[PDB]
PDB file of C-alpha atoms in Angstrom:
ATOM      1  CA  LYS A   1       0.512  -5.218   4.816  1.00 46.92           C
ATOM      2  CA  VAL A   2       3.135  -2.505   5.312  1.00 45.98           C
ATOM      3  CA  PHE A   3       2.408   0.652   4.076  1.00 46.39           C
ATOM      4  CA  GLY A   4       5.431   3.032   3.032  1.00 43.92           C
ATOM      5  CA  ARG A   5       5.573   6.350   5.079  1.00 45.99           C
ATOM      6  CA  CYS A   6       4.204   8.358   1.966  1.00 46.87           C
ATOM      7  CA  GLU A   7       1.621   5.737   0.858  1.00 46.85           C
ATOM      8  CA  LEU A   8       0.553   5.816   4.377  1.00 46.51           C
ATOM      9  CA  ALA A   9       0.184   9.658   3.982  1.00 44.18           C
ATOM     10  CA  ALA A  10      -1.719   9.852   1.095  1.00 44.64           C
ATOM     11  CA  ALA A  11      -4.353   7.350   2.272  1.00 45.33           C
ATOM     12  CA  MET A  12      -4.530   8.713   5.246  1.00 44.99           C
ATOM     13  CA  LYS A  13      -4.779  12.584   3.451  1.00 44.02           C
ATOM     14  CA  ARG A  14      -7.236  11.100   0.850  1.00 42.38           C
ATOM     15  CA  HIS A  15      -9.523  10.039   3.909  1.00 43.35           C
ATOM     16  CA  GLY A  16      -9.362  13.588   5.338  1.00 42.39           C
ATOM     17  CA  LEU A  17      -7.394  13.234   8.730  1.00 44.31           C
ATOM     18  CA  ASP A  18      -4.822  15.896   7.933  1.00 47.68           C
ATOM     19  CA  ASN A  19      -6.103  18.693  10.424  1.00 49.08           C
ATOM     20  CA  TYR A  20      -9.029  16.059  11.867  1.00 48.19           C
ATOM     21  CA  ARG A  21      -9.798  17.815  15.408  1.00 49.09           C
ATOM     22  CA  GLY A  22      -6.526  19.760  14.655  1.00 49.61           C
ATOM     23  CA  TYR A  23      -3.888  17.212  14.664  1.00 47.10           C
ATOM     24  CA  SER A  24      -2.118  17.467  11.737  1.00 45.97           C
ATOM     25  CA  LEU A  25      -1.474  14.551   8.906  1.00 42.45           C
ATOM     26  CA  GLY A  26       1.788  14.274  10.485  1.00 43.27           C
ATOM     27  CA  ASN A  27       0.469  13.731  14.171  1.00 46.77           C
ATOM     28  CA  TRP A  28      -1.365  10.607  12.065  1.00 49.39           C
ATOM     29  CA  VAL A  29       1.561   9.072  10.098  1.00 52.39           C
ATOM     30  CA  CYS A  30       3.811   9.470  13.515  1.00 53.34           C
ATOM     31  CA  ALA A  31       0.811   7.975  15.693  1.00 55.65           C
ATOM     32  CA  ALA A  32       1.078   5.184  12.699  1.00 52.86           C
ATOM     33  CA  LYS A  33       4.542   4.406  12.965  1.00 51.84           C
ATOM     34  CA  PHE A  34       5.261   3.606  16.212  1.00 50.87           C
ATOM     35  CA  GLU A  35       1.817   2.201  16.894  1.00 51.35           C
ATOM     36  CA  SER A  36       1.842  -0.236  14.475  1.00 50.41           C
ATOM     37  CA  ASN A  37       5.028   0.534  12.083  1.00 48.26           C
ATOM     38  CA  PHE A  38       2.741   0.748   9.552  1.00 49.62           C
ATOM     39  CA  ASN A  39       1.754  -2.535   9.768  1.00 51.12           C
ATOM     40  CA  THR A  40      -1.861  -2.848   8.648  1.00 50.33           C
ATOM     41  CA  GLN A  41      -1.843  -6.242  10.023  1.00 51.16           C
ATOM     42  CA  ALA A  42      -0.259  -5.361  13.524  1.00 50.30           C
ATOM     43  CA  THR A  43      -2.278  -6.928  16.086  1.00 50.60           C
ATOM     44  CA  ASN A  44      -1.542  -6.401  20.110  1.00 51.11           C
ATOM     45  CA  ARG A  45      -2.743  -8.144  23.300  1.00 54.27           C
ATOM     46  CA  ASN A  46      -3.284  -5.667  26.069  1.00 52.56           C
ATOM     47  CA  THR A  47      -4.156  -7.724  29.626  1.00 51.75           C
ATOM     48  CA  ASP A  48      -7.552  -7.122  30.598  1.00 48.96           C
ATOM     49  CA  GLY A  49      -8.401  -9.354  27.384  1.00 46.75           C
ATOM     50  CA  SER A  50      -8.626  -6.811  25.004  1.00 46.04           C
ATOM     51  CA  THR A  51      -6.565  -6.136  22.535  1.00 43.97           C
ATOM     52  CA  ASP A  52      -5.195  -3.352  19.957  1.00 43.45           C
ATOM     53  CA  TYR A  53      -6.037  -4.107  16.092  1.00 45.02           C
ATOM     54  CA  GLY A  54      -4.324  -2.335  12.823  1.00 43.39           C
ATOM     55  CA  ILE A  55      -2.581   0.466  11.414  1.00 43.64           C
ATOM     56  CA  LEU A  56      -3.687   2.555  14.249  1.00 41.90           C
ATOM     57  CA  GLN A  57      -3.814  -0.351  16.579  1.00 41.40           C
ATOM     58  CA  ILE A  58      -7.318   0.381  17.954  1.00 41.72           C
ATOM     59  CA  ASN A  59      -8.906  -1.340  21.083  1.00 43.46           C
ATOM     60  CA  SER A  60     -11.590  -4.222  21.240  1.00 42.61           C
ATOM     61  CA  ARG A  61     -12.418  -3.174  24.590  1.00 40.98           C
ATOM     62  CA  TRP A  62     -14.904  -0.752  22.980  1.00 42.28           C
ATOM     63  CA  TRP A  63     -14.703   0.525  19.135  1.00 40.59           C
ATOM     64  CA  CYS A  64     -14.829  -2.916  17.549  1.00 37.99           C
ATOM     65  CA  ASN A  65     -16.099  -6.727  18.197  1.00 34.37           C
ATOM     66  CA  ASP A  66     -13.384  -9.699  18.362  1.00 30.29           C
ATOM     67  CA  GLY A  67     -15.599 -11.717  20.376  1.00 27.51           C
ATOM     68  CA  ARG A  68     -13.349 -12.733  23.492  1.00 29.81           C
ATOM     69  CA  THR A  69     -13.522  -9.185  25.287  1.00 28.63           C
ATOM     70  CA  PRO A  70     -15.347  -9.664  28.166  1.00 27.57           C
ATOM     71  CA  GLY A  71     -16.461  -6.002  29.128  1.00 20.32           C
ATOM     72  CA  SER A  72     -16.827  -4.696  25.834  1.00 23.82           C
ATOM     73  CA  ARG A  73     -18.957  -3.122  22.873  1.00 27.12           C
ATOM     74  CA  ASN A  74     -18.007  -2.208  19.295  1.00 26.47           C
ATOM     75  CA  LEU A  75     -18.559   1.534  19.609  1.00 23.81           C
ATOM     76  CA  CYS A  76     -17.578   0.930  15.593  1.00 20.23           C
ATOM     77  CA  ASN A  77     -19.946  -1.342  15.107  1.00 21.31           C
ATOM     78  CA  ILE A  78     -17.499  -3.903  13.001  1.00 24.88           C
ATOM     79  CA  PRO A  79     -15.333  -6.935  13.628  1.00 27.50           C
ATOM     80  CA  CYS A  80     -11.879  -6.734  14.560  1.00 25.38           C
ATOM     81  CA  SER A  81     -10.449  -8.301  11.784  1.00 21.31           C
ATOM     82  CA  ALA A  82     -12.088  -5.505   9.400  1.00 22.04           C
ATOM     83  CA  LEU A  83      -9.723  -3.084  10.990  1.00 21.69           C
ATOM     84  CA  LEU A  84      -6.992  -5.044   9.980  1.00 21.21           C
ATOM     85  CA  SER A  85      -7.560  -3.991   6.312  1.00 18.90           C
ATOM     86  CA  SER A  86      -5.258  -3.143   3.670  1.00 19.81           C
ATOM     87  CA  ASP A  87      -7.442  -0.718   2.514  1.00 19.40           C
ATOM     88  CA  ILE A  88      -7.645   2.278   5.889  1.00 18.38           C
ATOM     89  CA  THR A  89     -10.725   2.998   5.213  1.00 19.57           C
ATOM     90  CA  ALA A  90     -12.488   1.440   8.124  1.00 21.47           C
ATOM     91  CA  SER A  91      -9.522   2.116  11.019  1.00 20.85           C
ATOM     92  CA  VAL A  92      -9.743   6.365  10.018  1.00 18.88           C
ATOM     93  CA  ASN A  93     -13.476   5.901  10.404  1.00 20.52           C
ATOM     94  CA  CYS A  94     -13.274   4.012  13.765  1.00 19.88           C
ATOM     95  CA  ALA A  95     -10.026   6.549  14.389  1.00 21.96           C
ATOM     96  CA  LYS A  96     -12.192   9.516  14.003  1.00 18.21           C
ATOM     97  CA  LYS A  97     -14.797   8.801  16.526  1.00 14.72           C
ATOM     98  CA  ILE A  98     -11.931   8.226  19.347  1.00 14.23           C
ATOM     99  CA  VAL A  99     -10.201  11.570  18.774  1.00 15.31           C
ATOM    100  CA  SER A 100     -13.545  12.614  19.275  1.00 15.42           C
ATOM    101  CA  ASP A 101     -14.218  11.150  22.283  1.00 14.12           C
ATOM    102  CA  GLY A 102     -12.852  13.762  24.634  1.00 12.82           C
ATOM    103  CA  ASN A 103      -9.166  13.152  24.774  1.00 14.66           C
ATOM    104  CA  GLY A 104      -7.868  14.077  21.025  1.00 13.15           C
ATOM    105  CA  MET A 105      -5.058  11.860  20.545  1.00 11.02           C
ATOM    106  CA  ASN A 106      -4.034  11.260  23.726  1.00  9.67           C
ATOM    107  CA  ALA A 107      -6.169   7.846  23.163  1.00  7.63           C
ATOM    108  CA  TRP A 108      -2.785   6.332  21.622  1.00  9.16           C
ATOM    109  CA  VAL A 109      -0.102   5.660  23.949  1.00  8.05           C
ATOM    110  CA  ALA A 110       2.315   5.291  21.260  1.00  7.58           C
ATOM    111  CA  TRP A 111       1.344   8.965  20.128  1.00  3.52           C
ATOM    112  CA  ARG A 112       1.126  10.542  23.273  1.00  6.74           C
ATOM    113  CA  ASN A 113       4.764   9.010  24.026  1.00  7.29           C
ATOM    114  CA  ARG A 114       6.562   9.322  21.050  1.00  8.66           C
ATOM    115  CA  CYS A 115       4.603  12.291  19.285  1.00  7.88           C
ATOM    116  CA  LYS A 116       2.666  14.414  21.072  1.00  5.91           C
ATOM    117  CA  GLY A 117       4.796  17.884  21.371  1.00  5.65           C
ATOM    118  CA  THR A 118       7.042  16.788  18.682  1.00  5.87           C
ATOM    119  CA  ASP A 119       8.533  18.133  15.202  1.00  6.66           C
ATOM    120  CA  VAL A 120       5.110  15.934  13.390  1.00  5.47           C
ATOM    121  CA  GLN A 121       5.498  18.001   9.921  1.00  5.71           C
ATOM    122  CA  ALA A 122       8.625  15.828   9.897  1.00  6.45           C
ATOM    123  CA  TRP A 123       6.643  12.724   8.841  1.00  8.35           C
ATOM    124  CA  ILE A 124       5.386  13.899   5.430  1.00  7.47           C
ATOM    125  CA  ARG A 125       8.228  15.352   4.212  1.00  6.77           C
ATOM    126  CA  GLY A 126       9.512  13.899   0.645  1.00  6.97           C
ATOM    127  CA  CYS A 127       5.588  13.193   0.659  1.00  5.69           C
ATOM    128  CA  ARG A 128       3.949  14.123  -2.556  1.00  7.27           C
ATOM    129  CA  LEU A 129       3.166  17.916  -2.146  1.00  8.96           C
TER     130      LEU A 129
END
């Protein structure tokens, strides 16, 4: 599936990511955009036998189970497949324990690159408000 910017935003807002751990919605839409480009089914293989799954490309090396990751655990107690849903529910829930894991949104490489220190509010412009 492919979310539209403002649809992803709302889904996002609805599941209370807006300002979570002090990180504005725009931060999250922006992280989404560069990470998965909104593609609910974006999957990205990393070396170290791990992979980034879903909207917010969350890693199976920890957080979610795909099986095949050698040095793994699923701190989020889910199959990596459930993090490839068309309903974000899970991704944000998982995504919530990772912002809270001592680093903030640094956890997401495309956010720290492309988004951190940016005028992230531009991502929620036109969005229903």
